[PDB]
Amino acid sequence: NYKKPKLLYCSNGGHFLRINPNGTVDGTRDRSDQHIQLQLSAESVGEVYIKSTETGQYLAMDTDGLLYGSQTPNEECLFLERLEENGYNTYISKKHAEKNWFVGLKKNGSCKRGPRTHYGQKAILFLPLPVS
Numbered sequence: 662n663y664k665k666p667k668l669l670y671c672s673n674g675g676h677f678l679r680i681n682p683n684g685t686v687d688g689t690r691d692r693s694d695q696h697i698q699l700q701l702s703a704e705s706v707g708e709v710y711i712k713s714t715e716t717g718q719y720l721a722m723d724t725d726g727l728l729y730g731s732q733t734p735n736e737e738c739l740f741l742e743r744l745e746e747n748g749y750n751t752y753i754s755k756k757h758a759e760k761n762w763f764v765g766l767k768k769n770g771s772c773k774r775g776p777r778t779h780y781g782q783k784a785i786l787f788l789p790l791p792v793s
């Protein structure tokens with residue numbers, strides 16, 4: 662199911678995860694935005710890389726839990742993808758997995774930093790959707 666690109670929709674504020682050309686990561690309510698098309702791929706079961714098709718940058722999480730775009734797919738870019746019972750997917754930073762730092766978007770579209778994320782919050786629930 663990683664064969665084609667997709668959008669990652671956050672049910673908290675209704676934002677599509679966006680990797681901007683300048684390297685910042687946020688969300689947008691505009692489904693037509695060119696920077697929300699993402700290619701997910703898995704080298705190992707349950708572990709994914711999430712890449713911007715438009716800029717080639719990989720989603721990554723820094724040491725303070727902020728999401729950013731990385732030119733290279735390194736250890737900071739691996740996420741543990743889990744399918745929750747409510748049917749939503751969650752993504753935990755593999756590097757920061759002991760701390761349960763999730764990929765998350767606030768209601769205003771800004772990244773909810775890893776340490777502020779917690780299981781049970783709407784900010785961490787994502788729905789993979791077809792591009793068009």
